[PDB]
């Protein structure tokens, strides 16, 4: 019932030569809707969901200027961090930025964030109160002081409590068909014996939306946090997601285990066992 | 909608 808008930015230095790579993508919940790629030809912000296309030229010009502005910022950042950390200019380095907002079932503001990584670790993050900063290390303190003096946090808080939420609502309504749908997971079950006396037994959840799901294993209705293999929820490429959970079990009690499937598209939990 | 404010060089 909750929802979220998030923007993801990756900036990668490709040194010895020049011109970094910048990729920005934007998501409403689990659905990508816009993107920008500095290596593509258009040099514009591009639609990636049917419902964002109907937006006007002022929107796209706007988003383009803003996204270019983000990259230029990151491009200065790469030099800057390189200096902060006494790194040479022979190595490829990475800046990452994630921001956005969460709303509840009624679409009222729930939470906001703006996080910043260098070479894949935390560099500086806006805290939950949206008024203060976490600096992961000593070099990051410099950035912190600068951002405090420049009142970055109040500006981000305006975006995160106002614009983000508002536009999330606009996107959810405009994209009603796609965004507010729930696809019930189609389930089934496979069995492959491993060593005569042993068999691996796997519970399959398919074609579900959104990505949030729960696949759990019980024996006789008892928790199995031990022997379990659980793979990351993965995209099917058609808007939905797939996942599974397997457990390794001695042959003969394949009816002493049940797999439980929880999803919001489901009326009640599904518990399955063998036939 | 992207942020149009609060994006500052580190």
């Amino acid at each position, epitope marked *: 019932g909750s929802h979220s808008m998030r923007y993801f930015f990756t900036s990668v230095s490709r040194p010895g030569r020049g011109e970094p790579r910048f990729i920005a993508v934007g998501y409403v919940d689990d659905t990508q809707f816009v993107r920008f790629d500095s290596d593509a030809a258009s040099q514009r912000m591009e639609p990636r969901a049917p419902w964002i296309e109907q937006e006007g030229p002022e929107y796209w010009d706007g988003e383009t200027r803003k996204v270019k*502005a983000h990259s230029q910022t990151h491009r200065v950042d790469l030099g800057t961090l390189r200096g902060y950390y006494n790194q040479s200019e022979a190595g490829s380095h990475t800046v990452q930025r994630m921001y956005g907002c969460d709303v509840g079932s009624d679409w009222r503001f729930l939470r906001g964030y703006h996080q910043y990584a260098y070479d894949g670790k935390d560099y500086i993050a806006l805290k939950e109160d949206l008024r203060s900063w976490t600096a992961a290390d000593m070099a990051a303190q410099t950035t912190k002081h600068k951002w405090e003096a420049a009142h970055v946090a109040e500006q981000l808080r305006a975006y995160l409590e106002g614009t983000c939420v508002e536009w999330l609502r606009r996107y959810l309504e405009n994209g009603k068909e796609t965004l507010q749908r729930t696809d019930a997971p189609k389930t089934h079950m496979t069995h492959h014996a491993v060593s005569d006396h042993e068999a691996t037994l796997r519970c399959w959840a398919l074609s579900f939306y959104p990505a949030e799901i729960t696949l759990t294993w019980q024996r006789d209705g008892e928790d199995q946090t031990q022997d379990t293999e659980l793979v990351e929820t993965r995209p099917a490429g058609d808007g939905t997601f797939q996942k599974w959970a397997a457990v390794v079990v001695p042959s003969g009690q394949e009816q002493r285990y049940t797999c439980h499937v929880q999803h919001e598209g489901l009326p009640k939990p599904l518990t399955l066992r063998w036939e | 909608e992207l942020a*149009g404010i609060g994006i500052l060089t580190v």
Partner: T-cell receptor
Framework: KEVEQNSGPLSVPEGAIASLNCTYSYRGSQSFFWYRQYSGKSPELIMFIYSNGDKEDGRFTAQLNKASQYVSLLIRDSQPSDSATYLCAVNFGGGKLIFGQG | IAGITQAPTSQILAAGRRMTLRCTQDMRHNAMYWYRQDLGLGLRLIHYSNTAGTTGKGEVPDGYSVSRANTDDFPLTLASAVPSQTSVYFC???????????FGQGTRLTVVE
């Protein structure tokens, strides 16, 4: 693009509440500024506003309505030293800071 | 004390001559701007720059060059000076894109044949 203020010149008596408005096209605009310009001088910031609602600063009140594409400036208790041209600026993206006519 | 400076403050140009207005700033601001003002048309954005090294076209790029080799400076350039460019020119700067712009003192420029 399109930033439009009240057509001047306006005349307000001393001590009275004065009121300026500004309307803008872009719905995605996120930052709004009010500047004061005396004749042959440089625009000086009276105030800024990011969020829907009111912002108080002494004799001045900014008012922003994102839904109506609207910014407002309210001068309480007018001095004659407020006799000046007033500028509305809105940001349309990156470096695209656009000014009203005044 | 950190601020922003234009130069010259005043200039008379013969038409066809080329001209560069200096503008510099020690506040460590990323974003800078050139505007023109005309006796009834308010300020109109000429060029801008979000960061050292990068630039962009405003409402009236038409007529003027521009460059941003570093953070401090943002010179505005006129190739062939037409009399239609007689205006007052302002350089302004802001911390980042979308935050308050601080103006310099201005430059009164008159182009005559």
């Amino acid at each position: 693009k399109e930033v439009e203020q009240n057509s001047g010149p306006l005349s307000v008596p001393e001590g009275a509440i004065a009121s300026l408005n500004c309307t803008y096209s872009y719905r995605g605009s996120q930052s709004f500024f009010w500047y004061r310009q005396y004749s042959g001088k440089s625009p000086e910031l009276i105030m800024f506003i990011y969020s829907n609602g009111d912002k108080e600063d002494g004799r001045f009140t900014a008012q922003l309505n994102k839904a109506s594409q609207y910014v407002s400036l309210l001068i309480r208790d007018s001095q004659p030293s407020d006799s000046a041209t007033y500028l509305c600026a809105v940001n349309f993206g990156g470096g695209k800071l656009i000014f009203g006519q005044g | 004390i950190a601020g922003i400076t234009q130069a010259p403050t005043s200039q008379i140009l013969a038409a066809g001559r080329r001209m560069t207005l200096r503008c510099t700033q020690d506040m460590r601001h990323n974003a800078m701007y050139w505007y023109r003002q005309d006796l009834g048309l308010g300020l109109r954005l000429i060029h801008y720059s979000n960061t050292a090294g990068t630039t962009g076209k405003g409402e009236v790029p038409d007529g003027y060059s521009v460059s941003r080799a570093n953070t401090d400076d943002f010179p505005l350039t006129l190739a062939s000076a037409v009399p239609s460019q007689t205006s007052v020119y302002f350089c302004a700067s802001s911390w980042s894109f979308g935050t308050e712009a601080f103006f310099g003192q201005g430059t009164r420029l008159t182009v005559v044949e």
